[PDB]
Amino acid sequence: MAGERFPADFVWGAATAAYQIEGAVREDGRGVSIWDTFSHTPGKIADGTTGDVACDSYHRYGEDIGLLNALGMNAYRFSIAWPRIVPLGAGPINQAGLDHYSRMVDALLGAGLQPFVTLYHWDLPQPLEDRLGWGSRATATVFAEYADIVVRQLGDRVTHWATLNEPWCSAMLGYYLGVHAPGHTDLKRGLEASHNLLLGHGLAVQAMRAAAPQPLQIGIVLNLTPTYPASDSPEDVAAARRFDGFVNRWFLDPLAGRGYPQDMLDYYGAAAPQANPEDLTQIAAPLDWLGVNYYERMRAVDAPDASLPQAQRLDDPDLPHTADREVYPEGLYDILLRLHNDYPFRPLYITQNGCALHDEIAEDGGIHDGQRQAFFEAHLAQLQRALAAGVPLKGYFAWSLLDNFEWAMGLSMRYGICYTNFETLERRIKDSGYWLRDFIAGQ
Ligand SMILES: OC[C@H]1O[C@@H](O[C@@H]2[C@@H](O)[C@@H](O)O[C@H](CO)[C@H]2O)[C@H](O)[C@@H](O)[C@@H]1O
Ligand SMILES: OC[C@H]1O[C@@H](O[C@@H]2[C@@H](O)[C@H](O)O[C@H](CO)[C@H]2O)[C@H](O)[C@@H](O)[C@@H]1O
Ligand SMILES: OC[C@H]1O[C@@H](O[C@@H]2[C@@H](O)[C@H](O)O[C@H](CO)[C@H]2O)[C@H](O)[C@@H](O)[C@@H]1O
């Protein structure tokens, strides 16, 4: 109650991504994505799984709606699969794909769930990757075309759109570190990809407003990792700044109209992209909102012998960990205060926040994920502190609605507020999901 109340119009949702949940990978005209190629490459996924079935949400999105409704949410953040809309990436449209999402949008609106659509959550059409993917400027152009196509048919009903989800991931995990699709391992390729992602974003924003049948609220979604030096030594502070630049400022600064950060430009040297002024203008399209995805902090020590950005994580054995990450709720406060004071974007949404645990169905049938309840409660407490500081936060989306295909970790790593039995496709609300239900209902 006191100190726990969000605005009455606050957006409360959960979030997913198409490849992680949909399955039906060859159905209804869908093309091949880089994640189909990657997950079907031996050894890329930890457990031998693919997204071929996943949660079967292409067919079972109505069950997903049932969960959202049972949780008392008022919004659902999901992605549209470009392979279902333009199966060749650049080519004809697939009306069956558009019609599927049209039906889903209508189902959401009929349930009182505002759709928050992500256009690109990592499932680049493989034919585009065969032509260098995000390494090619042309991919940016045809992304904007895709964005146009989708807004023309859904923009009478969906006001809130994001272009990209987490370009750092797509660029640096996909092209530099090789852990995500398409799996390249070259810094220059990653940096070029980052630029073409940003350019695609900016071109898409402009294409979408031109194509819009009503005013839209268009954003981008960034993962941000607040970074802290492990000591105040020059070496460790510099390591923190490089990591901060690598993940955060590289994207935030050009979106803000500030160009690429010059420290990072000079650091990247020959690997840095040719960033002409006209591209940067386009990249800095005004945003109606910015989405923040937050999981963890980085406490950095200098790592001179490591790959760029020469910064290694120093885990704090004080702090608890989940199945895969350190828990640090106060980082969310810090990064939001940073955005509020230091950058121009507003309003803000938390578009993903959640955690993975070794969730199990208990003897009674529930999932007793108390650490995840505590994760949500602690992060939401930080959001109330941020709101009290004036941060213009307008909503929160729990990551994820349901356990899903967790990229290179496969089905093994459970992030849901609902448990997914991947054999039967049954979903079950976890205790943390019931806590969110009851917390939101108190609003
Ligand atoms: O890209 C802008 C600017 O970023 C600086 O990083 C600062 C860091 O020095 C310190 O002040 O903490 C804040 C917030 O985390 C960072 O934004 C770089 O040092 C600087 O080279 C760069 O121009
Ligand atoms: O891994 C869970 C979810 O991860 C999300 O991406 C994360 C970024 O926000 C973060 O900054 O980096 C981590 C890796 O260190 C990313 O995995 C994805 O957007 C989700 O799709 C995914 O389920
Ligand atoms: O004024 C608030 C809006 O600011 C937009 O961003 C940038 C400008 O404020 C800044 O001065 O210049 C750049 C480059 O032209 C602008 O894009 C944000 O994108 C919006 O979210 C924000 O409401």
Side-chain angles (χ1 to χ4, degrees), residues 227 237 241 244 249 253 260-264 338 342-343:
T227 303
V237 176
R241 291 188 187 112
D244 178 67
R249 298 179 287 118
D253 282 5
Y260 290 110
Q262 188 57 56
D263 63 327
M264 301 306 299
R338 178 188 196 175
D342 305 7
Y343 285 97

Side-chain angles (χ1 to χ4, degrees), residues 40 132 148 159 178 240 253 360 393 399:
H40 284 272
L132 304 180
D148 169 321
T159 55
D253 282 5
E360 49 194 318
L393 188 68
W399 186 260

Side-chain angles (χ1 to χ4, degrees), residues 11-237:
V11 167
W12 288 111
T16 62
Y19 188 78
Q20 302 192 268
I21 67 168
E22 284 184 356
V25 288
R26 303 314 271 135
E27 297 190 31
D28 290 341
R30 185 175 174 279
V32 179
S33 83
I34 60 170
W35 272 95
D36 299 84
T37 305
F38 191 74
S39 71
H40 284 272
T41 301
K44 297 302 187 188
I45 312 302
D47 62 0
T49 65
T50 75
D52 286 1
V53 175
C55 308
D56 199 35
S57 294
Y58 186 75
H59 294 302
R60 300 181 191 248
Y61 66 83
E63 297 182 39
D64 297 348
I65 291 175
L67 296 170
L68 288 152
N69 180 62
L71 294 162
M73 297 285 184
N74 65 31
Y76 181 36
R77 175 164 180 274
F78 66 98
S79 83
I80 287 178
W82 186 355
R84 293 193 189 288
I85 308 307
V86 188
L88 298 173
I93 80 173
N94 178 46
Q95 190 64 41
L98 286 165
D99 290 346
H100 168 81
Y101 291 109
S102 182
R103 289 186 293 270
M104 181 182 170
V105 161
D106 288 348
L108 287 164
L109 292 169
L113 297 166
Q114 183 181 354
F116 268 62
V117 177
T118 306
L119 285 165
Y120 185 72
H121 202 136
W122 305 355
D123 44 350
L124 186 69
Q126 180 66 48
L128 301 179
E129 181 63 25
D130 294 342
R131 299 159 181 63
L132 304 180
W134 296 107
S136 173
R137 285 180 74 84
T139 299
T141 299
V142 301
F143 173 66
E145 295 172 357
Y146 155 68
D148 169 321
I149 290 158
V150 179
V151 156
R152 289 189 190 273
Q153 297 206 9
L154 301 182
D156 59 331
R157 285 160 291 163
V158 178
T159 55
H160 290 58
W161 298 83
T163 52
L164 307 180
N165 181 76
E166 301 178 330
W168 178 89
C169 292
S170 293
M172 301 301 184
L173 300 181
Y175 292 82
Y176 173 33
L177 302 177
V179 298
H180 283 184
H184 288 275
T185 55
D186 179 72
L187 177 62
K188 183 174 171 172
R189 291 177 185 257
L191 286 168
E192 173 185 51
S194 77
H195 185 70
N196 290 326
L197 282 155
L198 281 170
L199 177 63
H201 160 73
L203 293 174
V205 171
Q206 190 178 319
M208 293 162 74
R209 298 194 198 276
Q214 65 175 321
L216 304 181
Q217 306 302 311
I218 305 173
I220 192 173
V221 171
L222 303 180
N223 56 299
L224 300 174
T225 304
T227 303
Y228 305 81
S231 78
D232 74 347
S233 71
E235 294 73 12
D236 287 342
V237 176

Side-chain angles (χ1 to χ4, degrees), residues 237-251:
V237 176
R241 291 188 187 112
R242 293 185 302 271
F243 186 92
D244 178 67
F246 173 58
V247 182
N248 307 312
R249 298 179 287 118
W250 189 255
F251 296 93

Side-chain angles (χ1 to χ4, degrees), residues 184-381:
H184 288 275
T185 55
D186 179 72
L187 177 62
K188 183 174 171 172
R189 291 177 185 257
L191 286 168
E192 173 185 51
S194 77
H195 185 70
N196 290 326
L197 282 155
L198 281 170
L199 177 63
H201 160 73
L203 293 174
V205 171
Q206 190 178 319
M208 293 162 74
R209 298 194 198 276
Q214 65 175 321
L216 304 181
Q217 306 302 311
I218 305 173
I220 192 173
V221 171
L222 303 180
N223 56 299
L224 300 174
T225 304
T227 303
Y228 305 81
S231 78
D232 74 347
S233 71
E235 294 73 12
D236 287 342
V237 176
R241 291 188 187 112
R242 293 185 302 271
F243 186 92
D244 178 67
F246 173 58
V247 182
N248 307 312
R249 298 179 287 118
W250 189 255
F251 296 93
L252 290 165
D253 282 5
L255 288 166
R258 298 178 183 167
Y260 290 110
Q262 188 57 56
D263 63 327
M264 301 306 299
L265 285 175
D266 289 335
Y267 177 55
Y268 288 149
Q274 30 262 80
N276 69 48
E278 299 77 8
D279 288 4
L280 287 169
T281 298
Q282 196 75 58
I283 289 167
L287 296 180
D288 302 301
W289 58 272
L290 173 69
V292 177
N293 292 354
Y294 179 76
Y295 295 89
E296 63 192 5
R297 69 159 181 180
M298 173 61 164
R299 182 161 80 124
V301 292
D302 194 24
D305 296 322
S307 307
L308 306 207
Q310 292 168 294
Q312 273 191 13
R313 172 171 269 104
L314 188 71
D315 279 293
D316 184 347
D318 282 5
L319 295 170
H321 288 235
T322 66
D324 63 347
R325 299 187 193 286
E326 181 193 68
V327 180
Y328 192 69
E330 296 82 4
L332 179 55
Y333 181 84
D334 289 343
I335 204 74
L336 288 173
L337 268 285
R338 178 188 196 175
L339 287 169
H340 177 54
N341 291 309
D342 305 7
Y343 285 97
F345 310 108
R346 48 182 177 274
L348 306 178
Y349 290 82
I350 305 309
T351 38
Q352 303 183 191
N353 175 237
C355 65
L357 298 173
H358 302 115
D359 296 302
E360 49 194 318
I361 294 174
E363 179 65 16
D364 60 281
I367 302 85
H368 307 309
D369 61 337
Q371 187 179 13
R372 181 174 297 111
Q373 184 280 327
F375 187 100
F376 289 132
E377 190 170 6
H379 291 80
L380 291 171

